[PDB]
From a paper:
We identify the core polyadenylation complex within T. gondii and establish CPSF4 as a reader for m6A-modified mRNAs, via a YTH domain within its C-terminus, a feature which is shared with plants. In the CPSF complex, the T. gondii CPSF4 subunit can be distinguished as one holding a unique architecture which interestingly is shared with the plant CPSF30L family, and it constitutes a co-occurrence of three zinc fingers and a conserved YTH domain. In parallel to the orthodox 3’end processing mechanism which occurs independently of the m6A modification, we propose the existence in T. gondii of an m6A-dependent polyadenylation through which the m6A site would guide the polyadenylation machinery, via the ability of the CPSF4 YTH to bind this modification, thus allowing the recognition of the respective m6A-dependent polyadenylation site, and the proper termination at a relevant locus.
TgCPSF4-YTH (aa 434–598), as used in the ITC experiments generated distinct crystal forms: Apo, m6A bound and m6A modified 7-mer RNA bound which all diffracted to high resolutions (up to 1.45 Å for the RNA bound form), sometimes using fully automated upstream crystal harvesting (using the EMBL crystal direct technology) and automated crystal diffraction (using MASSIF-1 at the ESRF). The binding of m6A favors crystal growth in P1 symmetry instead of a P41212 symmetry, however, the binding event does not induce important conformational changes within the protein, the N-terminal residues (ranging from 437 to 446) fold as random coils on opposite sides, most likely as a consequence of crystal packing.
Residue numbers in the entry: 433 to 589
The structure:
């Protein structure tokens, strides 16, 4: 639902998901128009999180970028009327588009985090996260804090 506080404030419930993108151009489109889409399986998972969590955070990592480009809040359920067809033919293999509010654009490398593993993903290194991988709230909160502390990038510039 709607945000009733800042995503960094402690009293709200949060879930944190890693989003992978094969194309930087898709990230640029997401920043430009506040929109994302994911696989049908991830769409259901994110939908169930969206209705039952105060804030759903999406941590964006382009394939082979070596890290994160920023993070955003999921703002709506998948919506067939939101920017229909914006992604081109891949739209046909995805769930419906949903609104995203980008909350930080930055550069941070997985290797700057040292030996970080995800106990919710078989204790695998953060770099091996797949699209839709959930991270525990203590780690997710820290990743968003560390990203927020970095200088803001203007990735569209």
């Amino acid at each position: 639902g709607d945000p009733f506080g800042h995503v960094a404030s402690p009293q709200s419930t949060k879930r944190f998901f890693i989003i992978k993108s094969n194309r930087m151009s898709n990230i640029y489109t997401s920043i430009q128009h506040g929109v994302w889409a994911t696989s049908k399986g991830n769409s259901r998972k994110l939908s169930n999180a969206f209705t039952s969590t105060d804030h759903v955070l999406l941590l964006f990592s382009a394939n082979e970028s070596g890290g994160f480009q920023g993070f955003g809040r999921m703002m709506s359920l998948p919506d067939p009327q939101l920017f229909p067809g914006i992604w081109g033919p891949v739209q046909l293999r995805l769930g419906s588009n949903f609104r995203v509010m980008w909350l930080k654009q930055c550069k941070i490398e997985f290797e700057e985090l040292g030996k970080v593993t995800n106990p919710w993903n078989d204790d695998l290194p953060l770099r091996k996260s797949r699209d839709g991988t959930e991270v525990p709230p203590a780690l997710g909160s820290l990743l968003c804090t560390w990203m927020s502390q970095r200088p803001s990038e203007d990735l569209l510039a």
